[PDB]
Curated annotation (Swiss-Prot):
Residue stretches making up the USP domain: 122-394
Residues in UBP-type zinc fingers: 1-96
One GO location term (cellular component): U4/U6 x U5 tri-snRNP complex
Positions contributing to Zn(2+) binding: C32, C35, H51, H57
The organism's place on the tree of life at top rank: Eukaryota
Name the record gives this protein: Pre-mRNA-splicing factor SAD1
Subunit structure: Component of the 45S U1.U2.U4/U6.U5 penta-snRNP particle, a subcomplex of the spliceosome.
Additional remark text: Present with 167 molecules/cell in log phase SD medium.
Native source organism of the sequence: Saccharomyces cerevisiae (strain ATCC 204508 / S288c)
PANTHER family in UniProt: U4_U6.U5 TRI-SNRNP-ASSOCIATED PROTEIN 2 (PTHR21646:SF16), UBIQUITIN CARBOXYL-TERMINAL HYDROLASE (PTHR21646)
């Protein structure tokens, strides 16, 4: 254990692509726990073994089996579980939870630089590229029954996609992060390279639908939980008694169409701009007849901002001001707002996506924009352009 004082936790990032930085191989990759680079190991002549002699760095983590090794001794560090430093590092690579930990989530935590964060309510690097994916991962990680299943189970038997996704969800909730933000560049890049994710354009709705469908085709357990918790159903219906066509359509996400909008009208006050209350968008179902015949525990709405089959879809998007508060009722079933994905503008204008999430325990809204988090007031959330919302059914 003499070498454990050489470990430098601040250099360790386990969100990176798991490849050897010398051979670019993904096979048998180790992380050097002194400098944090990855090396294929661990036999003589391997990059990790050579690194250990030439750079004088001797403590490694096998990134696949999570066992610790001394090199060039080439011996496993046993009882790594009794060693605080080692527990800490193994937890950074693969957070573990028991049911009672979840009872005190979320809570204020501190990263290694003593920056405080509320666990589960953290941001992500490279929002310029992956903001649409950050919002979707946060949404699904904050649906308690889905989150709990990912945090408390292991997924070595359900294929590479489900294992990688489970690890993202486990890190999103980690109360012991070394730094208070995550990278999911490699996860999203893996989806494009190996799981055929190739939508262009893409946005939080298209990616949420893709990700729910991919989860369902990959895991029978998660399929049954998403089907039960998230999947709604709409029924559309119209001397000789005709019964008339009845379609029952399941949905993950219910699209609410906004009133016709002209991008060329300008004004200098909010009362000059079009507005509509969310309850009025739902009139369709609460007044051919449309009915929500299955109301899920989590009801996800999409506000149809974009006409993608016309020129400059972002610039010409429907900017009707959608008004909502934190509660809603649909034919006597009450819901409370839990998540709000907002569209921000930064050839066409470019979309940027930010995610606001509700914490029941402290009763605060936290807005996650890139790695920044800011509290927001509930009554003013609707002033930004809402795109997707998650509502949770109340007893
Ligand atoms: Zn090193």
């Amino acid at each position: 254990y003499a070498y454990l004082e050489t470990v430098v936790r601040e250099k360790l990032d386990f969100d990176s692509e798991k490849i050897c930085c010398i051979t670019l191989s993904p096979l048998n990759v180790y992380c050097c726990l002194v400098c944090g680079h990855y090396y294929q190991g661990r036999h003589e002549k391997s990059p990790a073994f050579i690194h250990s002699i030439d750079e004088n760095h001797h403590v490694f983590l096998n990134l696949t089996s999570l066992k610790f090794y001394m090199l060039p001794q080439n011996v496993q560090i046993l009882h790594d579980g009794e060693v605080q430093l080692l527990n800490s590092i193994k937890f950074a690579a693969y957070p573990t939870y028991c049911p009672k930990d979840l009872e005190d989530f979320p809570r204020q935590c501190f990263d290694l630089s003593n920056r405080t964060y509320l666990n589960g309510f953290i941001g992500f690097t490279n929002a310029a590229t992956y903001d649409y994916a950050h919002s979707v991962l946060l949404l699904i990680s904050h649906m308690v029954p889905v989150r709990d299943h990912f945090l408390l189970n292991h997924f070595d038997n359900q294929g590479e996609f489900i294992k990688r996704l489970s690890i993202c969800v486990k890190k999103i909730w980690s109360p012991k992060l070394f730094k208070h933000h995550l990278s999911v560049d490699d996860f999203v890049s893996y989806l494009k390279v190996r799981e055929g994710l190739n939508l262009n354009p893409i946005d939080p709705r298209l990616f949420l639908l893709w990700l729910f469908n991919k989860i369902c085709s990959s895991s029978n357990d998660l399929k049954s939980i998403l089907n039960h918790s998230c999947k709604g159903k709409v029924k559309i219906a119209k001397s000789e008694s005709v019964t008339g066509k009845v379609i029952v359509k399941p949905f993950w996400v219910l699209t609410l169409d906004l009133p016709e909008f002209s991008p060329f009208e300008d004004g200098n006050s909010v009362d000059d701009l079009p507005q509509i209350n969310i309850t009025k968008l739902l009139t369709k179902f609460t007044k051919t007849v449309f009915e929500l015949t299955r109301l899920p525990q989590f009801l996800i709405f999409h506000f149809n901002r974009f006409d993608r089959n016309s020129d400059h879809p972002v610039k010409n998007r429907n900017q009707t001001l959608v008004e909502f508060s934190s509660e809603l009722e649909i034919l006597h079933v009450k819901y409370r707002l839990k998540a709000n994905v907002v569209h921000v503008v930064i050839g066409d204008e470019k979309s940027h996506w930010i995610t606001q999430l509700y914490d029941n325990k402290s009763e605060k809204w936290i807005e996650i924009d890139g790695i920044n988090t800011t509290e927001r007031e509930a009554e003013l959330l609707f002033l930004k352009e809402t795109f997707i919302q998650v509502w949770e059914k109340q007893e």
